[PDB]
Amino acid sequence: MNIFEMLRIDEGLRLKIYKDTEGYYTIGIGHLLTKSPSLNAAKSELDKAIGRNTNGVITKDEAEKLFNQDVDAAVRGILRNAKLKPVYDSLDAVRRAALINMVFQMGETGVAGFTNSLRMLQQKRWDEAACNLAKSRWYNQTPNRAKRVITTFRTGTWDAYKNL
Numbered sequence: 001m002n003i004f005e006m007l008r009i010d011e012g013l014r015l016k017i018y019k020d021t022e023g024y025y026t027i028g029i030g031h032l033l034t035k036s037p038s039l040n041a042a043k044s045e046l047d048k049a050i051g052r053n054t055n056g057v058i059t060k061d062e063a064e065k066l067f068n069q070d071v072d073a074a075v076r077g078i079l080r081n082a083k084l085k086p087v088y089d090s091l092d093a094v095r096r097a098a099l100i101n102m103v104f105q106m107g108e109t110g111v112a113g114f115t116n117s118l119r120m121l122q123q124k125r126w127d128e129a130a131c132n133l134a135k136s137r138w139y140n141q142t143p144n145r146a147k148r149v150i151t152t153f154r155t156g157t158w159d160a161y162k163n164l
C-alpha cells in the first residue's frame, strides 16, 4: 500500500465526466474539474487540463497523469502551509499518507482549519485525534472513507485498506 493505491481505492477510476459525492463535476481518479453547475464549464476545464478537445472522455493514461499531478499538488500544498507542514513533518510515512489523503479530498485550506485535530496528531494522541476528526462535516458526509483515513491515523497501519 502507498498514497497512490490508497487514493485510487478512495476515489475510484471513471473515464467520463461524473459528479462526485458533493455533486461536483469530476473525472479520472477524483480529479475535481469545477464547482460550477455548468457541464460546459466542466468540459472546458477538462480540455484545458488535458491539453486537447475531449468529448468529456479521457484515457486511463490521461486519468493517471492528472492523478500524479494532483497527488504532487496535495503534498506541495501541505509543505507550503504553515499549519500543515509541522504536522506532516512530525508524522511517520503511513500517517503522512493519511494527511495527503485529506488534503486531496478537501484542499489545503480545508484541512489546515482542523486546528484541534492537527494539535492532537502533532501530540501523537492517536485515539484522541481519531475521536476529534470524526466530529466533522467530512466524517458525516463521507463516513466510510473518513473511517478508513481515521483508522490510518489511529493505528499507523494500512489495516483499513487491506482486502480492498
Ligand SMILES: *SCC1=C(Br)C(C)(C)N(O)C1(C)C
Binding pocket: 130, 131, 132
Ligand atoms: S470519540 C468518543 C467515543 C469513543 Br472513544 C467510542 C468508545 C468509540 N464511542 O462510542 C464514542 C463515540 C463515545
Ligand SMILES: [Cl-]
Binding pocket: 010, 011, 012, 020, 021, 026, 029, 030
Ligand atoms: Cl470519486
Ligand SMILES: [Cl-]
Binding pocket: 049
Ligand atoms: Cl489541472
Ligand SMILES: [Cl-]
Binding pocket: 141, 142, 143, 144, 145, 146
Ligand atoms: Cl464514504
